């Protein structure tokens, strides 16, 4: 049961990983089409921007939350010139990676699970298997390659919009001087942290895509089972995202905090 399910998902992820070169050398056009579909959404959600718009809105909201709460607390205490120095750190440590992970999970993973479930129910996977095509290599590996290609621009936009929202809220709505914010932002921000955050987000996106493709590829029960598969995949994706970010942050900054203020 539990061991059998773990073995099945392990076999699925192994077979999806080992077929990445095959899809790279054989299904380039499908990879480009999936890159476009993931970047600009699909269905009724594609008209508003697809994944880009949802990621941007959620990251703007998270940055605004950081700026508002930090500035309020520091103004109540009194040391309110540190706000940027606070916000940056949050955006690199906890908020932006996890938030971008959840939004990417929701949009891209739910879309992938729905598409793969529709293909499974409509016998399109069986159609591919009949035509002598590796269904897993054609579908899951292509999704993984598209996600790996698209994640870096998506997380770059997420980081940019989070920083922009935090700075705008702090220095326009709260009327803080832009020079002080920029000084405390660029002084206490290390590019090493941003690079490691990008690595975390890349690994997290790969895991999320694998999980959602697993849940959507083996869908069953007609059109009704697709929604249940989407829900279960979302739960697993949230758990995996939070766990991965926690483990990575514990590993990187466990001994060396990479932050100096005092002597």
């Amino acid at each position: 049961r539990f061991l059998d399910s773990m073995g099945h998902v392990a076999w699925f992820v192994v077979q999806a990983i080992v077929h990445v070169p095959h899809a790279f050398r054989h299904y380039r056009r499908e990879s480009l089409r999936l890159v476009a579909e993931i970047g600009m959404g699909t269905g009724a959600m594609a008209v508003i921007g697809g994944t880009v718009a949802i990621i941007g809105f959620v990251t703007l909201s998270a940055g605004s939350l950081i700026a508002i709460q930090g500035f309020a607390s520091l103004g109540n205490i009194g040391v309110e010139a540190f706000t940027g120095f606070f916000a940056a750190l949050a955006n690199i440590r906890v908020v932006a990676p996890v938030v971008t992970g959840q939004a990417l999970a929701a949009t891209v993973g739910a879309g992938a699970t729905a598409e793969l479930g529709a293909m499974r129910i409509s016998e399109e996977v069986d159609a591919l298997e009949v035509m002598g095509i590796k269904s897993i290599s054609y579908l899951v590996s292509t999704r993984i390659m598209a996600g790996a290609i698209v994640i870096i621009p998506l997380y770059a936009m997420a980081i940019l919009l989070s920083f922009m929202s935090a700075q705008l809220v702090t220095t326009i709505f709260y009327s803080q001087s832009v020079g002080t914010y920029e000084h405390y932002f660029h002084t206490f921000l290390r590019v090493d942290d941003v690079m490691w955050s990008f690595l975390e987000v890349i690994i997290m996106s790969v895991i999320v895509m694998l999980n959602h493709c697993y849940f959507g590829y083996f869908a069953s029960g007609g059109a009704v089972g697709v929604g249940e598969a989407v829900g279960r995949s979302m739960r697993t994706s949230l758990i995996a995202i939070v766990l991965v970010v926690l483990l990575a942050s514990l590993a990187l900054y466990g001994t060396d905090p990479n932050f100096n203020l005092t002597v």
Partner: protein
């Protein structure tokens, strides 16, 4: 095969947005040229003591930022500081490196003070051998405690 040209339109607009966002993030927010060392030259300094100076601390000339500290290392005669300074800023050859703290909570940095403010300038790879370090809080606290303790209060 395929090539609907609407997928192509989505791809090209996504690529344009990607390039714009990546360039803006790299330049105006991450400051990748500053981190890598593009457009800056390397300088060194010798200190009797670090004075709390740390890597990535600001390098200043009379308080304004002109570079960043790359590394601070222990040495036999004190501390060795390696920093990068923007090539648009030239410091005089008689300058002194003063470690400083912005406020009572921390934020250590290093300032380059030159009384003359002209003449010969340092060349990349050189070292500043004259430096000063602020008085530590601990010795001041000890001195204040002893000076207040030696007073006979009954005599007061």
């Amino acid at each position: 095969m395929l090539l609907t040209r609407f997928i192509k339109m989505q791809l090209v607009i996504f690529l344009t947005l990607t390039l714009v966002a990546l360039v803006v993030l790299a330049l105006f927010y991450l400051r990748l040229p500053t981190w890598a060392g593009l457009g800056m030259y390397k300088l060194n300094a010798d200190l009797p003591n670090s004075g709390g100076l740390y890597a990535t601390a600001n390098v200043t000339y009379r308080g304004t930022t002109i570079g960043k500290v790359t590394s601070v290392e222990p040495s036999e005669s004190g501390a060795r500081v390696e920093m990068n300074i923007y090539d648009r800023y030239k410091i005089p050859a008689d300058a002194t490196a003063n470690v400083h703290s912005v406020s009572a909570v921390g934020e250590q940095f290093i300032d380059l003070t030159s009384d003359s403010g002209g003449g010969a300038y340092f060349q990349p790879g050189d070292t500043i051998t004259k430096a000063t370090v602020p008085a530590e809080v601990g010795p001041a606290l000890d001195a204040a405690e002893k000076g207040l303790a030696v007073l006979p209060k009954e005599k007061i």
